[PDB]
Amino acid sequence: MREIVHLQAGQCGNQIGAKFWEVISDEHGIDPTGTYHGDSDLQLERINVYYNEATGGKYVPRAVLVDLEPGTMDSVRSGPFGQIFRPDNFVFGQSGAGNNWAKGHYTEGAELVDSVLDVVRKEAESCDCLQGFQLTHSLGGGTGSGMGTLLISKIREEYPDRIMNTFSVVPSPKVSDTVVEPYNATLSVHQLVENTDETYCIDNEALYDICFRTLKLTTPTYGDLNHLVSATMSGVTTCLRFPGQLNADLRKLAVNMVPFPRLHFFMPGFAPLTSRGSQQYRALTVPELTQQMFDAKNMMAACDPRHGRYLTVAAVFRGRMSMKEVDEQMLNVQNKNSSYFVEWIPNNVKTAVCDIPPRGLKMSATFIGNSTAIQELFKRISEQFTAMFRRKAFLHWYTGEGMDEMEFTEAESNMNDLVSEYQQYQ
């Protein structure tokens, strides 16, 4: 019925992407060999959103991957669940960039994306009606921020009215892992605000914080970290695939939580969490979700929401539960929390209920949010970007590749209009 496409950019995108299709292949009962062996029949009914039918009951992902480092792509090739990916669905380049935005977009961008669109149109015309696209890009990485924008730009120019639901990782206070990250982040937002349908600001620092303070793992390597990120993505995209007592497909999700054509950043959250101390001491009910729904321990972005208000909050609850129990738990806190929310939009939460729980689990809850606490994250991102031009430092690589200095200043014209628009309603 509705088909979807997964773009990918960056070396960091591979580990997010590989764990993603590792998580969601399990929840339908697919082995890495490619032979379905399961009992649930509703999965095969709506399997046509992600995969593509092959001979003998096999299905191949509609995952498009773009990178400039074959070494991590070789690992994706040698990965366990990567053996279900299609060969030409891989788009891998031989020349790198160097963690700079210009090399992926202008120089190496002139050749690799011609191999991308042929893969896309090969996958595009085999579908019934394409619901949209997903891209997992970045702001701190040079290659992911680079081609991710040009992946966004030419597809929007090719596809006029569809959905574009992305997942992008934002800078953090204490997990600063690149010097030119403020250079890379700010000008990537320039291509985001004008031209992206959905982006989900996942912050690394909270992912570390939740594995330490909240999931309490002794050695939580990155495979644990991508295990949160993939399940946040699937909570967004389980209503399109699975029937529930209150269904909300992505287009009306894109309608509801995007009130304005620009201010469409999102701040995820997904907390069916259980520490290794606490397997049995929790009382897994709908009321315990609601306290855990707005506790700061559960959200993905390193910000304190008590310095602002939530604009739109969506609480997709997936599992076996009653609607009268669902709404009333949020109905009370809409009345009770008269301060933490925005006042110009009453009834601040519209929910959705899904019946099928995730595998290996009983009942789980998501979160999608736009808030008026993202000023200071956007404020602190801008303030160094202005300060990095006063000393004019590090810019001669971008300058020396044939580019203008004004393109660094034109983003500050555009990013200041972004943060001043958040200032207008606040």
Partner: protein
């Protein structure tokens, strides 16, 4: 797909390079005879199953190249990759740069083209030299001038040996190091330095060794080259590219000279007692004793830091370490770079060698840091030349080859131009 090309020029670069590829075959489990994906970055394959290293050793004297031919690795190194210099420049910059080196520099480009067509994908060039040797300062200079002609943008790392602040085995070193800095400013992409005294100093108080050899030095230096290339060598959690930190760790077209610092320098008897946490090693990272550049870190300001963690490290306490780092008031950074950090994480720990003095530790860490305190070393390099050039000392040796007389002072103006900006950028 990726491959690495390394060039060794000078007596030190041959002697340093001897310990380097000794490690490369041992880390990859390859016998020195030349036989037994991850070995793609350093060895080109033979159809019989052998692998040919991608290292070029050029020296103007035969006395150490032919020594390599007498080594056990004579069944490894390619016979045409060793170039015998007919006559040595003998610590005279103008000899190789203007009279002697022209005969054999044509042969080097034949080796470069032969290695380039064998390279299906090039990450960059690796350049090894010391600042005392005339071949290591002059023959590189018209090689680095030449290497810009054929290739303009691919990576060029000039692994350098900075002269020690208090000792030297040379006398015309203030002439040669001045003549080094002119070519590196105009052409060179990246250049790391260490000084022999801190290499002497760390093996005194950490490894507790009284009597080393230069092999006992060069085994430490090759670990740094292993750590920088380990991202390209092996798949890790956070792989880096040469062009990445060439863009990243370099701030400016003038300053591409950061410092090197490695840890843990803990001996085999010594490591059995210790408790090695990542917070332990990173608190051991920023002590001035563990750096291999003898210059006080409190004289300048920190600019950037690269922390190439390797082994079994979980990225949690990595981030809390830098957060613990950033709070202190003793360590001062530059306000125009609040994001001055980057951490590399690779899975495979380094491999110890039989007959070595290091310990088999689970975790290792390197430091690729640039700091404004290095002006004090360069103020000394300007001051030592100023005490030498006032009364026309040693001018006759260089001029007899054909180079001009007053162009010695041109590099003084060019060196001072580099030294003027440390008060501008620094303040």
């Amino acid at each position: 797909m990726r491959e690495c090309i390394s060039i060794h020029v000078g007596q030190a670069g041959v002697q340093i390079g001897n310990a380097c590829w000794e490690l490369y075959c041992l880390e990859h489990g390859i016998q020195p005879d030349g036989q037994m994906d991850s070995f793609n970055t350093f060895f080109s394959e033979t159809g019989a199953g052998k692998h040919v290293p991608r290292a070029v050793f050029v020296d103007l004297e035969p006395t150490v190249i032919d020594e390599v031919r007498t080594g056990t690795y004579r069944q490894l190194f390619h016979p045409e990759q060793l170039i015998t210099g007919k006559e040595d420049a003998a610590n005279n910059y103008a000899r190789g740069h203007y009279t002697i080196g022209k005969e054999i520099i044509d042969l080097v480009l034949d080796r470069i083209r032969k290695l380039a067509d064998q390279c299906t994908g090039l990450q960059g060039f690796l350049v090894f030299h010391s600042f005392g040797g005339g071949t290591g300062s002059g023959f590189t200079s018209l090689l680095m001038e030449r290497l810009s002609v054929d290739y303009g943008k691919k990576s060029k790392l000039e692994f350098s040996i900075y002269p020690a602040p208090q000792v030297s085995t040379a006398v015309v070193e203030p002439y040669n190091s001045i003549l080094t800095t002119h070519t590196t400013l105009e052409h060179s992409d990246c250049a790391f330095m260490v000084d022999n005294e801190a290499i002497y100093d760390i093996c005194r108080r950490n490894l507790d060794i009284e009597r080393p050899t230069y092999t006992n030095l060069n085994r430490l230096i090759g670990q740094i080259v292993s750590s920088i290339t380990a991202s390209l060598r092996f798949d890790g959690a956070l792989n880096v590219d040469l062009t990445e930190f060439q863009t990243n760790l370099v701030p400016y077209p003038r300053i591409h000279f950061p410092l090197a610092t490695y840890a843990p320098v803990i001996s085999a008897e010594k490591a059995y007692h210790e408790q090695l946490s990542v917070a332990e090693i990173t608190n051991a990272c920023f002590e001035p004793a563990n750096q291999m550049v003898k210059c006080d870190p409190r004289h300048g300001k920190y600019m950037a830091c690269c922390l190439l963690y390797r082994g079994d490290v979980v990225p949690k306490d990595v981030n809390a370490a830098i957060a613990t780092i950033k709070t202190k008031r003793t360590i001062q950074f530059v306000d125009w770079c609040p994001t001055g950090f980057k951490v590399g994480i690779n899975y495979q720990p380094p491999t110890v060698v039989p007959g070595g003095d290091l310990a088999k530790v689970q975790r290792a860490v390197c430091m690729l840091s640039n700091t404004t305190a290095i002006a004090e070393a360069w103020a000394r390099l300007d001051h030592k030349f100023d005490l030498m050039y006032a009364k026309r000392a040693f001018v006759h040796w260089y001029v007899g080859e054909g180079m001009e007389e007053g162009e010695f002072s041109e590099a003084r103006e060019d060196m001072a131009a580099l030294e003027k900006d440390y008060e501008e950028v620094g303040v």
